[PDB]
Amino acid sequence: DRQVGYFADNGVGNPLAIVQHPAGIHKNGITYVSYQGPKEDPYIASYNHQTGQWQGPFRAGISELGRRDGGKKFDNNGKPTMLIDDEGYIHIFYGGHGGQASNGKNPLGNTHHGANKHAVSKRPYDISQWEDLNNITPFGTYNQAIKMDNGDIYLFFRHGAHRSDWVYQKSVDNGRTFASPVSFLKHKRRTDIDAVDSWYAWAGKGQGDNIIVSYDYHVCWDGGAGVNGRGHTTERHDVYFMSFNTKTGEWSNVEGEKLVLPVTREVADEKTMAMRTGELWTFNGSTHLDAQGQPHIAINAGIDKGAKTGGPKQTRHVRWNGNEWVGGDKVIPQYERVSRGDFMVTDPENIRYLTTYNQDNDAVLSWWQSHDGGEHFVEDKTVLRKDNASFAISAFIKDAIPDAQMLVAEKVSDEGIKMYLVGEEGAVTRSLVDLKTAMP
Ligand SMILES: C[C@@H]1O[C@@H](O)[C@H](O)[C@H](OS(=O)(=O)O)[C@H]1O[C@@H]1O[C@H](C(=O)O)[C@@H](O[C@@H]2O[C@@H](C)[C@H](O[C@@H]3OC(C(=O)O)=C[C@H](O)[C@H]3O)[C@@H](OS(=O)(=O)O)[C@H]2O)[C@H](O)[C@H]1O
Numbered sequence: 001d002r003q004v005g006y007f008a009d010n011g012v013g014n015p016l017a018i019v020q021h022p023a024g025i026h027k028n029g030i031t032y033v034s035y036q037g038p039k040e041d042p043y044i045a046s047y048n049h050q051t052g053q054w055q056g057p058f059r060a061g062i063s064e065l066g067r068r069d070g071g072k073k074f075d076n077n078g079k080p081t082m083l084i085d086d087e088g089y090i091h092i093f094y095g096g097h098g099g100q101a102s103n104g105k106n107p108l109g110n111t112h113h114g115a116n117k118h119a120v121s122k123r124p125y126d127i128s129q130w131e132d133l134n135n136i137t138p139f140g141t142y143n144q145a146i147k148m149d150n151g152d153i154y155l156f157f158r159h160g161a162h163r164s165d166w167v168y169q170k171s172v173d174n175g176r177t178f179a180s181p182v183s184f185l186k187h188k189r190r191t192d193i194d195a196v197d198s199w200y201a202w203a204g205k206g207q208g209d210n211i212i213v214s215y216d217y218h219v220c221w222d223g224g225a226g227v228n229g230r231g232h233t234t235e236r237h238d239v240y241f242m243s244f245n246t247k248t249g250e251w252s253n254v255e256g257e258k259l260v261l262p263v264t265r266e267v268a269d270e271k272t273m274a275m276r277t278g279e280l281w282t283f284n285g286s287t288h289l290d291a292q293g294q295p296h297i298a299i300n301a302g303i304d305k306g307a308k309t310g311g312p313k314q315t316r317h318v319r320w321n322g323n324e325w326v327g328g329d330k331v332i333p334q335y336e337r338v339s340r341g342d343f344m345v346t347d348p349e350n351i352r353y354l355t356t357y358n359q360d361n362d363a364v365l366s367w368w369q370s371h372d373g374g375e376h377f378v379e380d381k382t383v384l385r386k387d388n389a390s391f392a393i394s395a396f397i398k399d400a401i402p403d404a405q406m407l408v409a410e411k412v413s414d415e416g417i418k419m420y421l422v423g424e425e426g427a428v429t430r431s432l433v434d435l436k437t438a439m440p
């Protein structure tokens with residue numbers, strides 16, 4: 001037997017992403033981790049930090065996205081999101097890419113395929129057996145699950161495919177019943193161009209009873225519209241910020257001005273814009289408050305090179321300094337390829353990304369540190385590096401301890417993808433004999 005760096009070897013497509021978060025959660029010395037496995041089904045494992053023993057991975061549910069007739073080989077937009085409720089049941093949200101006509105008429109957007117799903121562990125703190133609840137709307141993409149101190153659960157998602165509002169559904173009974181969706185970002189026809197307002201949001205905990213939300217805007221072009229009829233692309237621009245007080249129900253911008261829901265593009269441009277990116281195309285990151293309560297934002301952006309996705313995009317850091325939004329500088333200086341990363345912030349000046357990037361054909365995951373509020377980052381220790389690969393990463397694990405902070409997927413082909421749990425220094429190893437016994 002020997003220790004290997006990966007805890008599973010069956011990921012497919014993009015098995016992780018920052019937008020489906022938490023992908024893993026730490027509680028009482030156990031780190032729970034989830035990712036997308038064969039047929040895009042959600043898999044979950046756990047690591048017991050005191051005993052050194054892994055459990056799983058176990059399949060938590062059955063995704064429609066892995067059983068489509070044709071189309072893209074892997075969809076990936078329904079990789080799993082995790083939450084542990086106040087009774088210890090583990091919830092997995094997964095499988096949605098906006099539903100389809102068989103689920104009903106989507107009242108808050110359009111559809112594509114794959115009904116959004118909700119599984120729960122049969123017993124508290126036991127990841128081995130699962131049951132379907134599917135008590136949320138099937139018209140969902142991009143699950144983001146937040147539990148407040150009183151146990152209330154907010155599930156944020158897009159209520160359909162591109163041309164849909166973003167919403168949350170709230171549960172006060174540990175995820176067993178959800179209230180109807182509440183729209184907080186509006187999709188609608190533009191009155192100036194042949195496009196629909198569309199959005200991508202990242203919601204996470206703020207301080208107290210606040211939830212904070214960063215988002216970029218998608219210019220959702222009609223077919224044949226746009227410059228020289230380029231049609232529908234992934235064109236996205238800019239980044240915005242607002243806050244949600246879960247005690248009062250009210251939303252506000254960084255200055256505390258209250259917003260009427262759902263927020264339209266026109267109000268967002270007036271009230272919640274954080275950083276314009278000009279002609280640069282964006283891919284959203286995440287947001288976190290510093291120790292003075294001021295929001296920091298990771299936003300990826302890059303030059304449009306004419307591709308359907310524009311071109312490669314690099315992570316940039318933005319922050320509220322108490323009076324104005326500042327920043328926009330790249331985390332990795334002079335880098336022009338693809339980078340992604342999540343960050344931690346303490347004092348407003350002190351920001352650390354764990355970021356992935358490529359050097360030649362190799363994948364790198366390393367820490368980058370700023371002490372000047374995000375204008376300059378310097379690379380510190382490398383946590384994982386793999387030749388002839390690229391990394392998909394999770395957001396930082398909820399309540400992470402130093403040994404287990406982020407999940408990584410070593411993309412080589414689009415199946416058989418090795419899955420890693422990494423900490424300050426490197427991977428949380430698993431016995432190979434144990435892994436082979438457990439797989440799948
Ligand atoms: C649901 C949409 O239905 C139709 O309108 C159409 O098929 C559309 O495709 S599109 O014209 O290319 O936009 C469908 O949209 C896809 O699903 C997503 C959605 O918003 O519904 C989108 O995916 C996000 O953005 C992608 C760029 C990303 O894809 C990864 O990253 C890149 C890249 O940066 O070049 C390329 C690969 O597609 C993939 O590695 C998605 O990530 S995921 O983990 O694969 O899910 C996701 O973040 C997007 O609009 C379409 O892919």
Ligand SMILES: [Cl-]
Binds near residue numbers: 314
């Ligand atoms: Cl990119």
Ligand SMILES: [K+]
Binds near residue numbers: 018019
């Ligand atoms: K990502």
Ligand SMILES: [Zn+2]
Binds near residue numbers: 162198220
């Ligand atoms: Zn679109």
